[PDB]
């Protein structure tokens, strides 16, 4: 009895202590069980997060009372070497809050459909027994179609059922494919590495039926086009543990603690090993808190600082006191010794295309691809075609390597770098200079648009009898940097204080960074690299990669690393981290995701061009290609709208198209047979005559736009959708907040390749289907919302660029309410589709266009210039001057049986990627035993793909990263090309086979694979380019080396053959609207930056109450104290940010750490929480992407050119956005537009 215990008062007194200050008691402590019983739980399950953060952290999911209650990080990753910190615990604040979603008030529990669509669907079905005909009756009626499209984003969702939505979806899909074409059905899902099978689910269903799979790396602007340019690689980087092997690191435009949270300890810990660190950010970012020095260049001007640093490096470590390490490195691993041809201009020369073996008399003994092999001079003045150029990759074998050898004699040669001291004469070559251009918001330095430099040349006798002057990439580079070499060049610097094209004094003016800092760090960085043989590293992120001129920012950093021999050495190099792009078991996952086990090829599309086109953002373009050309280019050869350049790239096979042709591609084969020719020839003939046209020429004719769109693992309309208001108007058909006038309303010049109409087609999408576990902004604007399983309710796998472990997502409990995993949702849609299509679609023949692919023999398309077949400059040759035209047979009724089985092509054709292929029969044999096999039907005898685990085992068994047997076969295939043995890279792990159930027990380190360029090894950490440098495997570029010189015609004419400084572009989005809708408060234009937020990963977790509570409770924008005071804005005041593109509402965070002139609205706070109506649009306030708009860059449209050839997520236009400016002002009326009568007015 507790009451009776009170009488033991005195007896429970033990000894006093500390001279009477304390008393020890002997009293009951049973109440302590109250907190013990909270901590106790039923079990822990291992799972992870399918969100785009790059973390790839394994967690312990706690189940208590049969419910998910919380999570804590697993700490059992295989430990790293004794001299490296281990990875545990990893984790981050966003991930720690995921459990909140399972039973929260924003969880999607049941399939939902827009009321108006449901009412019409059910009425239609009562008049049309076939659902395809019911869909037709609604969609072909303008008033019915408009009635549910205008209801998008306007409430009215009602609970439906899986059976009802699956029938409608299937019916709409069949209708669309049958009447317009398979490619009028599309799906958007990103970053498969975060949840491989989950991505694969929809991509596989879409690929089987012919739908388009939209890309994401380029669209999100995470693809740094400078990587494909320099290395012929999408992106390959050192793992975070490798930062620990570096002795000098610069974190440049990368907010490590905030955006690489689970890996940040490697950066804080390496400082204790003596490593110096430097933060380069315009604001006092979290990353600065961790570094030894904080440099703050004006945002967008980083390339200027990088050029000046490279200048100091070249001057001091290459010219004045040559570094033996650096000199040998650039000689063997760059295109510097390569010869460039000079073009005659008026009074001077311009750098032209690179010299090819085919240019010389005897073609330097090259009979195979002589026009694709570069040339250099050996140290004995003799011309040679060194091993490794792209020409040696295809049509022959044994010479595609970086052995310093003569491609003809097979003898060892030594390449010469500079011609200085052996030139026949000195010539003057003009270099473009853009440093004097720019808006009023950035400092400029006036020199001349064309800077003449004295270059040492040699005259050569070409094979066509003509004569030509050549110089090396090396000489061209030193001149471009402004390095005086004794020729008394007036445009070269006499010192670092000389304001010349690219000195420390010059950069100080452009960037505001003190020249002595530029010099001191450039020197320390290079000195460190010299002493350690390349252990200097640069960690770079979206701070630099999301600018329109991201390639100049990147090539500036890349050149610094190359000049110091840092790429390819552990502890050194280019460490680019953005999204979770590294899906390690790539060739195991690709066949699954794109149904390549059944049909080849699939229909991949580059999303930036796709949305620029279909959401009609091109109709509002303000940037012209003309204003981007080199001053030395022929302006008349590049006329037209930016979209015209895309259309031209598409018809030349450079970039993919979607929809592809202006006629249903399922109907072409029938017409070809009635005309007595095979489908391919009939298509080529029709294209030439114009009887069949590329759909991109007429995007608004009513048949050339996407009609069905699946969205999953994406919040396209609340996060990544640049040009949000254009998407609402043109794709959705709803109200929108666009403020500006289009080209037509302004009487502007209409495109020359695309039709124009004054009133653009709106509401293009007939059906938008989104799969999610929380009601996101995208769900709010959809027609049908399908509840999906959270990451703690389904099985899947995850990998990342940051570490080498593959681990799983696991179901801690069956999905709650009526939710289903993404795999099961698409499996069920595939099943309903298969039955609904009967009698509408059968065994069909599809004509599919396919762009010329990087890593295929066809990449050797247009070797010396650009020819447009539509202009008659050459014939239309699919696969060379146009896209390949492929025949694909589709068995529509068998879609489900195919979806659920591993197809026969793995056995009939094999598997492969990145230019190599291998036999995978034994893997298919194993899979029959692990997954069991189909008992009957179309896929009888094939392994099964019934569950997500079956799918994961397919990925694990087929990939070289997860199956030692495949790894050795993969390295063997590569060895054929290089003539060097590489199998030793995986022989010691040949018996290794990673299994799904084993990774649930402990994450497993993957196997060294030819798909990548670093090694998974116990003595050296993973570092990109390591195999190129150490195994002598060439980079997949024209020269086989790291490419400093970009000689493609478009690169030359757009002024980017060499790295040059380019100022932020003028989007012209403000001057036309500022002051036009005054609320009485002051307005001011500011640079609008959108770095990634601390309280969410993109928009995921943005609605999570834990994150909203640790943040500021909803959408906010950061302003400098000076700008806020100027505008009369106090901390937390409601503000409105707007331009021609749209408007957004949010609250201010006023801070000293934001420099005057810029505002930061951290990346994606989306449109569902705590947003009042806009005084500009009279609608709900918009989001950060309501003020942005897509503007493509022509150099990113280049294809058919070795390293510049297409690949899903490898090349394509990018969704850059940091150059944007906006008008900012304090709000007056705060109206919520909800009928609550709870509105406010901010005074003054």
């Amino acid at each position: 009895s507790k009451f009776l215990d009170r009488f033991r008062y005195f007896k429970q007194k033990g000894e006093t202590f500390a001279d009477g200050h304390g008393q020890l008691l002997n009293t009951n402590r049973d109440w302590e069980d109250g907190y013990r019983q909270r901590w106790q739980h039923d079990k822990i399950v291992r799972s992870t997060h399918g969100v785009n953060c790059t973390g790839s952290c394994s967690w312990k999911i706690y189940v208590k009372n049969g419910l998910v209650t919380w999570e804590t990080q697993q700490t059992d990753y295989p430990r790293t070497r004794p001299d490296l910190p281990n990875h545990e615990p990893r984790g981050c604040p966003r991930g720690a809050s995921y459990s909140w979603y399972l039973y929260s008030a924003n969880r999607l529990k049941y399939p939902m459909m827009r009321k108006r669509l449901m009412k019409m669907w059910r009425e239609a079905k009562a008049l049309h027994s076939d659902p395809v005909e019911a869909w037709a009756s609604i969609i072909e009626d303008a008033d019915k179609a408009k009635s549910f499209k205008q209801a998008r984003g306007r409430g009215g969702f009602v609970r439906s059922s899986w059976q009802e939505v699956n029938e409608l979806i299937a019916a709409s899909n069949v209708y669309t494919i049958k009447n317009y074409g398979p490619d009028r059905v599309a799906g958007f899902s990103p970053i498969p590495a975060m949840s491989m099978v989950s991505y694969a689910s929809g991509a596989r269903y879409l690929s089987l039926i012919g739908g388009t799979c939209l890309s994401f790396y380029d669209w999100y602007c995470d693809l740094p086009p400078a990587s494909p340019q320099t290395w012929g690689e999408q992106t390959d980087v050192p793992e975070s543990a490798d930062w620990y092997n570096s002795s000098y690191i610069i974190a440049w435009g990368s907010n490590v603690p905030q955006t690489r949270t689970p890996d940040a300890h490697f950066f804080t810990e390496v400082r204790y090993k003596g490593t110096k660190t430097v933060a380069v950010t315009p604001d006092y970012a979290e990353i600065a808190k961790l570094c030894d020095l904080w440099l703050a260049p004006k945002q967008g001007t980083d390339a200027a600082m990088a050029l000046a640093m490279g200048h100091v490096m070249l001057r001091e470590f290459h010219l004045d006191n040559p570094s033996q390490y650096f000199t040998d490195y650039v000689r063997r691993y760059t295109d510097m010794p390569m010869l460039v041809m000079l073009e005659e201009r008026d009074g001077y020369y311009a750098a032209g295309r690179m010299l090819r073996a085919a240019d010389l008399v005897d073609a330097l003994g090259q009979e195979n691809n002589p026009e694709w092999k570069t040339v250099a001079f050996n140290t004995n003045g003799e011309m040679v075609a060194p091993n490794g150029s792209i020409g040696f990759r295809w049509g022959e074998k044994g010479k595609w390597n970086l052995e310093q050898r003569d491609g003809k004699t097979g003898e060892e040669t030594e390449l010469q770098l500079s011609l200085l001291g052996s030139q026949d004469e000195i010539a003057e070559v003009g270099f473009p200079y853009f440093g004097g251009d720019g808006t009023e918001h950035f400092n400029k330095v006036e020199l001349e648009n064309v800077l003449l430099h004295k270059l040492p040349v040699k005259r050569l006798q070409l094979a066509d009898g003509s004569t030509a002057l050549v110089t090396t990439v090396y000489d061209l580079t030193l001149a471009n940097y402004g390095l005086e070499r004794g020729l008394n060049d007036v445009n070269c610097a006499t010192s670092y204080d000389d304001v010349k094209a690219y000195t420390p004094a010059w950069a100080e003016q452009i960037t505001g960074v003190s020249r002595s800092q530029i010099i001191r760090i450039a020197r320390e960085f290079a000195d460190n690299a010299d002493k350690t043989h390349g252990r200097s590293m640069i960690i770079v992120g979206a701070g630099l990669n999301h600018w329109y001129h991201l390639d100049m920012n990147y090539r500036g950093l890349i050149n610094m690393l190359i000049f110091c021999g840092c790429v390819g050495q552990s502890g050194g190099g280019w460490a680019h981290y953005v999204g979770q792009e590294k899906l390690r078991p790539q060739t195991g996952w690709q066949p699954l995701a794109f149904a390549l086990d059944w049909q080849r090829p699939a229909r991949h599309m580059n999303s930036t061009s796709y949305f620029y086109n279909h959401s009609s953002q091109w109709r509002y373009e303000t940037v012209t290609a003309e204003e981007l050309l080199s001053p030395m280019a022929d302006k008349s050869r590049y006329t037209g709208h930016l979209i015209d350049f895309n259309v031209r790239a598409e018809r030349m096979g450079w970039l993919p198209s979607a929809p592809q042709l202006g006629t249903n591609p399922l109907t072409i084969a029938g017409e070809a047979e009635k005309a007595g020719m095979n489908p391919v020839d009939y298509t080529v003939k029709s294209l030439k005559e114009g009887s069949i046209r590329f759909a991109a020429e007429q995007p608004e004719n009513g048949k050339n736009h996407p009609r069905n769109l699946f969205i999953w693992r994406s919040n396209l309309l609340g996060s990544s959708g640049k040009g949000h208001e254009f998407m609402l108007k043109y794709l959705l058909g709803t109200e929108h907040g666009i403020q500006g006038k289009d080209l037509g309303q302004q009487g502007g010049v209409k495109p020359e390749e695309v039709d124009w109409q004054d009133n653009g087609l709106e509401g293009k999408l007939d059906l938008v289907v989104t799969l999610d576990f929380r009601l996101s902004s995208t769900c709010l604007y959809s027609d049908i919302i399908l509840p999906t399983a959270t990451w703690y309710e389904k099985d899947d796998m995850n990998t990342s660029d940051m570490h080498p472990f593959i681990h799983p997502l696991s179901a801690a409990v069956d999905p709650a309410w009526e939710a289903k995993s993404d795999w099961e949702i698409y499996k069920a849609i595939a099943k309903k589709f298969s039955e609904v299509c009967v009698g509408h679609l059968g065994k069909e023949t599809d004509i599919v266009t396919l762009p010329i692919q990087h890593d295929s023999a066809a990449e050797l398309a247009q070797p010396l210039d650009v020819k447009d077949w539509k202009k008659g400059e050459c014939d239309l040759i699919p696969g060379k001057t146009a896209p390949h035209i492929m025949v694909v047979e589709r068995d529509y009724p068998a879609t489900y049986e195919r979806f659920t089985s591993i197809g026969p092509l793995m056995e009939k054709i094999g598997n492969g990627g990145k230019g190599i292929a291998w036999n995978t029969q034994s893997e298919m044999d194993l899979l029959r035993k692990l997954n069991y096999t189909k008992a009957e039907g179309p896929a009888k005898g094939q392994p099964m793909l019934n569950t997500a685990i079956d799918a994961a085992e397919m990925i694990l068994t087929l990939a070289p990263e997860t199956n030692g047997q495949v790894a050795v076969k993969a390295w063997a295939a590569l060895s054929e090309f290089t003539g060097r043995d590489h199998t030793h890279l995986a022989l010691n792990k040949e018996d290794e086979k990673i299994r799904f159930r084993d990774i649930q027990a402990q994450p497993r380190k993957i196997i060294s694979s030819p798909t990548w360029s670093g090694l998974e090894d116990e003595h050296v950490s993973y570092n990109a380019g390591y195999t190129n440098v150490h195994e002598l495997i060439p980079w997949r570029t024209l020269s086989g080396r790291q490419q400093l010189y970009q000689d493609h015609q478009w690169m030359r004419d757009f002024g980017e053959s060499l790295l040059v400084y380019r100022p932020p572009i003028d989007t012209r989005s403000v001057k036309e609207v500022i002051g036009q809708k005054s609320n009485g408060n002051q307005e001011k234009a500011l640079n609008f930056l959108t770095p990634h937020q601390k309280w969410g990963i993109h928009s995921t977790y943005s609605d999570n109450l834990l994150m909203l509570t640790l943040g500021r409770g909803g959408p906010v924008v950061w302003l400098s104290e000076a700008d806020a005071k100027d505008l009369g804005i106090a901390d937390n005041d409601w503000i409105e940010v707007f331009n021609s593109n749209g408007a957004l509402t949010a609250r201010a965070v006023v801070s000293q750490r934001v420099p005057a002139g810029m505002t930061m609205m951290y990346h994606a706070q989306e449109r569902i929480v705590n947003l009042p109506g806009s005084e500009i649009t009279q609608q709900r306030g918009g989001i950060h992407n309501s003020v942005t708009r897509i503007t493509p860059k022509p150099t990113h449209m280049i294809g058919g050119y070795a390293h510049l050839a297409y690949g899903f997520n490898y090349y394509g236009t990018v969704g850059s956005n940091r150059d944007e400016f906006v008008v900012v002002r304090k709000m007056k009326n705060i109206d919520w537009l909800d009928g609550e009568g709870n509105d406010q007015v901010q005074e003054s």
Partner: protein, 509 residues
């Protein structure tokens, strides 16, 4: 001399990346209930700033901690026993909910149920978790000042800027910020325990964790004022106070606290400290507040000293606890390397959660600078965070121990760089700070590599000692409601018996 043991904690602020993961995991486990939704047992504050609750370090306003009277005796700043009782009907110093923040949620369901034909896109507006009413605006939150969120003039009201000419820090080029994660300090001389009239708060003898007994607490809410770190939070619903419990359910079996094991930056170390409980009052009542730090180090005992080992055994400390104390990372950082310092020792509570101060980028200067004593690496005098600010936070204003900690970290860096970049032995910086190569290599092992087994050395709390673990293992957890738990007397009005006990006595002795 009475030896007791406790698992102390050291947080390395130099490695803190201010991510708050520690805060989210603690919240999910311990304080997601209505009544404590606004309470963050572990919370992280960006400095300069006033923190959570606002201006908690201002003891003139909040009245926390102890004062040393003229006669040399200790008294809670809130008042002696009678003064305290006299304030019981309405604690005049009590922090109000608005000093924390008004907890909120959002009407997410409006996104789901908005009716057909809405004139505008539906949205989820905020609602108070205290009243259930619509909030027109969210004006405060527990981490409102995160990353210098707010005008410098407002953040700089920070108590730690005392005695500092702070204007230069309002200049963009001189900007600095750091993170201060904090939890309960589980003090040796807790002011909370001393200020609770019901005696519901106690320090556990075996592991030093300080708890508020949820049975015995009567909700007098005086302890909240007493605690100078403001780490006790009133549960507005149960009417009782709660606080960080140092994850005792895990510590008891030798596991790290949740915030320790989930610390992403790998900055938290857990290790035993043996202390002389009989010296606590003498140490906490030392005349000069600048001597509290050292007076506390003097109460900590050397676990490898056989005199201490024999006394510990005599005083009941388990063998595995003494052994853990001998490999304690906390003892190494606080006592041997002198890298860890107490948080606000001037409150006189003898706190047991210590901190290694952070390094920072060099300050703004006329030029790019020159090589200093540490070569390309920083010299302590160049760091941009003012050392006086850190001394106000950790050493009662004395910059000497702060400079020694920072200089030693930089010296380790200089030594390691010589080794790993130049391949040479250079102990010059170590000699200057009084460190040996062996000490620098050990510092490096614990701070840099920081293997899991080196960050957490937590022994068992030995729940079997002086108790009956066998019947408990067999019957704990069957919560049917026997009504007999919590009292030593067996008589109970409901005529029941304990489920986890043996009622049939052996008659064979």
């Amino acid at each position: 001399m009475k030896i007791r043991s406790q698992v102390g904690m050291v947080l390395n602020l130099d490695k803190c990346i201010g991510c708050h993961t520690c805060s989210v995991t603690c919240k999910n486990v311990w304080t997601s209930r209505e009544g404590v939704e606004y309470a963050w047992f572990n919370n992280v504050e960006t400095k300069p700033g006033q923190g959570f609750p606002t201006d908690w370090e201002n003891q003139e306003k909040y009245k926390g901690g102890w004062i040393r009277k003229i006669n040399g005796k200790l008294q809670p700043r809130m008042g002696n026993r009678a003064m305290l009782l006299g304030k019981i009907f309405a604690n005049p110093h009590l922090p109000g909910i608005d000093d924390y923040y008004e907890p909120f949620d959002f009407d997410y369901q409006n996104l789901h149920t908005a009716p057909e034909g809405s004139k505008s896109q539906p949205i989820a507006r905020p609602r108070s978790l205290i009243t259930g009413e619509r909030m027109a605006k969210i004006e405060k939150g527990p981490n409102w000042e995160d990353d210098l969120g707010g005008e410098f003039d407002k953040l700089a009201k920070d108590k730690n800027f005392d005695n500092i000419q702070k204007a230069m820090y309002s200049q963009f080029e001189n900007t600095f910020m750091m993170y201060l994660p904090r939890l309960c300090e589980h003090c040796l001389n807790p002011a909370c325990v001393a200020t609770c009239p019901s005696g519901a708060i106690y320090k556990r003898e075996e592991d030093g964790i300080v708890l508020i007994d949820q049975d015995k607490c009567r909700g007098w809410r005086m302890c909240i004022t007493g605690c100078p770190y403001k780490k006790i939070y009133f549960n507005w619903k149960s009417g009782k106070s709660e606080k960080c419990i140092f994850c005792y359910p895990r510590i008891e079996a030798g596991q790290p606290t949740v915030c320790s094991e989930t610390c992403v930056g790998r900055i938290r170390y857990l290790g035993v400290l043996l202390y002389d409980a009989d010296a606590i009052e003498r140490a906490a009542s030392t005349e000069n507040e600048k001597d509290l730090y050292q007076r506390q180090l003097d109460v900590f005992l050397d676990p490898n000293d056989p005199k201490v080992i024999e006394q510990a055994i005599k005083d009941g400390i388990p063998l595995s606890v003494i052994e853990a104390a001998q490999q304690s990372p906390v003892y190494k950082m606080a006592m041997e390397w002198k890298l860890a310092l107490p948080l606000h020792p001037e409150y006189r509570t003898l706190p047991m959660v210590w901190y290694v101060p952070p390094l920072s980028p060099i300050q703004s200067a006329a030029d790019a600078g020159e090589l200093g004593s540490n070569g390309i690496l920083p010299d302590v005098e160049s760091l941009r965070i003012p050392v006086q600010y850190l001394a106000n936070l950790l050493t009662a204003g004395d910059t000497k121990p702060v400079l020694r900690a920072l200089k030693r970290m930089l010296a380790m860096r200089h030594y390691k760089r010589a080794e790993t970049v130049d391949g040479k032995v250079d102990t010059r910086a170590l000699e200057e700070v009084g460190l040996t190569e062996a000490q620098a290599q050990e510092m490096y092992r614990y701070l840099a590599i920081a293997n899991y087994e080196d960050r957490f050395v937590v022994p068992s709390s030995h729940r079997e000692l002086a108790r009956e673990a066998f019947p408990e293992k067999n019957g704990c957890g069957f919560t049917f409601g026997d009504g007999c738990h919590g009292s030593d007397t067996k008589f109970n009005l409901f005529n029941s018996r304990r489920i986890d006990a043996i009622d049939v006595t052996s008659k064979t002795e």
